[PDB]
Scaffold this active site. Sequence first.
Site, PDB file in Angstrom:
ATOM      1  N   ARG A 105       4.159 -11.604 -20.757  1.00 36.90           N
ATOM      2  CA  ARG A 105       3.310 -11.194 -19.652  1.00 36.90           C
ATOM      3  C   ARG A 105       2.150 -12.182 -19.611  1.00 36.90           C
ATOM      4  NH1 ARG A 105      -1.313  -6.738 -19.698  1.00 36.90           N
ATOM      5  NH2 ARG A 105      -1.922  -6.798 -17.487  1.00 36.90           N
TER       6      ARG A 105
ATOM      7  N   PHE B  98      -6.485 -14.883 -16.191  1.00 34.24           N
ATOM      8  CA  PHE B  98      -6.757 -13.665 -16.917  1.00 34.24           C
ATOM      9  C   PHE B  98      -6.394 -13.839 -18.401  1.00 34.24           C
ATOM     10  CE2 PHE B  98      -5.403  -8.907 -17.272  1.00 34.24           C
ATOM     11  CZ  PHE B  98      -6.432  -8.663 -18.152  1.00 34.24           C
TER      12      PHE B  98
ATOM     13  N   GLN C 292      -0.111 -12.828 -22.838  1.00 32.76           N
ATOM     14  CA  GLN C 292       0.195 -11.717 -23.757  1.00 32.76           C
ATOM     15  C   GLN C 292       1.537 -11.946 -24.421  1.00 32.76           C
ATOM     16  OE1 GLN C 292      -0.531  -7.779 -22.199  1.00 32.76           O
ATOM     17  NE2 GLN C 292       0.894  -6.780 -23.618  1.00 32.76           N
TER      18      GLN C 292
ATOM     19  N   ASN D   4      -2.876  -2.933 -26.070  1.00 32.38           N
ATOM     20  CA  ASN D   4      -2.676  -1.579 -26.480  1.00 32.38           C
ATOM     21  C   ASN D   4      -2.241  -0.738 -25.295  1.00 32.38           C
ATOM     22  OD1 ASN D   4      -4.997  -0.374 -25.104  1.00 32.38           O
ATOM     23  ND2 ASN D   4      -6.310  -1.287 -26.720  1.00 32.38           N
TER      24      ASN D   4
ATOM     25  N   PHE E  84      -3.188 -10.713 -26.966  1.00 33.68           N
ATOM     26  CA  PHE E  84      -3.370 -11.612 -25.849  1.00 33.68           C
ATOM     27  C   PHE E  84      -4.464 -12.608 -26.132  1.00 33.68           C
ATOM     28  CE2 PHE E  84      -7.151  -9.569 -23.822  1.00 33.68           C
ATOM     29  CZ  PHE E  84      -7.097  -8.308 -24.401  1.00 33.68           C
TER      30      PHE E  84
ATOM     31  N   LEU F  93     -12.842  -5.384 -20.792  1.00 32.32           N
ATOM     32  CA  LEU F  93     -12.039  -4.969 -21.930  1.00 32.32           C
ATOM     33  C   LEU F  93     -12.866  -4.664 -23.176  1.00 32.32           C
ATOM     34  CD1 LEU F  93      -9.056  -7.393 -21.329  1.00 32.32           C
ATOM     35  CD2 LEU F  93      -9.319  -5.013 -20.561  1.00 32.32           C
TER      36      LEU F  93
ATOM     37  N   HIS G  50     -10.339  -2.927 -26.102  1.00 31.59           N
ATOM     38  CA  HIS G  50      -9.433  -3.731 -26.905  1.00 31.59           C
ATOM     39  C   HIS G  50     -10.202  -4.343 -28.054  1.00 31.59           C
ATOM     40  CE1 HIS G  50      -6.010  -3.614 -24.006  1.00 31.59           C
ATOM     41  NE2 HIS G  50      -7.007  -3.289 -23.200  1.00 31.59           N
TER      42      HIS G  50
END
Length: 164
Positions: free
Chosen positions: A54, A59, A62, A101, A112, A121, A125
Site C-alpha cells: 500500500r 503520504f 506501507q 495498525n 510505514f 497520526l 501510531h
Amino acid sequence: GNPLVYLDVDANGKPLGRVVLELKADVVPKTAENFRALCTGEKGFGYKGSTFHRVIPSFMCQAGDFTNHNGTGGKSIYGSRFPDENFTLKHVGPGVLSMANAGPNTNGSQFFICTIKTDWLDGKHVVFGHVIEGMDVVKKIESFGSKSGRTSKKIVITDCGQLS
Ligand SMILES: Nc1cccc(-c2noc(CCl)n2)c1
C-alpha cells in the site's frame, strides 16, 4: 546504541537499493526490538520476501504484511498483536518510520515510512525510528503508488537485517 537495520528493495525484480533505518530503542524498546528481530528473521519469520503493498504518493509507503501480503496480516515477535508502547516520537516529516495498525493496541508487523509530515497520526501510531540513508529508494517506491494505495510495480523487500 540504537539498532541500525536495512531493507533491500526490488521493483519488478530489479534492485532499487537499500533503506537504512535507525530504531529508537531508547524511546520505544519493545517496538524497536520487534522490528529489529523481524528484519533479522531470527525468530523464524519476518520481512524477507514480503512487499510494500500500500503506497500513497505524498503520504507514505506501507509494508510488513508477511502473512497475507495485503494489509490484513502480519504478526509480532510477542504474539499476534501488542500494545501501543508510547506516542512520544512524532510524525515530524519525511523519513519517519511508524507502526501501522487497526486501532488502539493493534501493532503487529506492518509499518510505514512517511514521505511527508503526517501530524494527524500523532497519538494514534507509534513512531519508532527514521530513515538514515536511502530516501531516494523511498521516493522511488513512492512513485509506484496511487491514490488508492495500489502499487503499479511489485515492490519486494528481497533482503533485510541488522547493521549494528
Ligand atoms: N497490525 C496491523 C496493521 C494494519 C492492519 C491490521 C489488520 N487488519 O486486519 C487484521 C486482522 Cl487481525 N489486522 C493489523
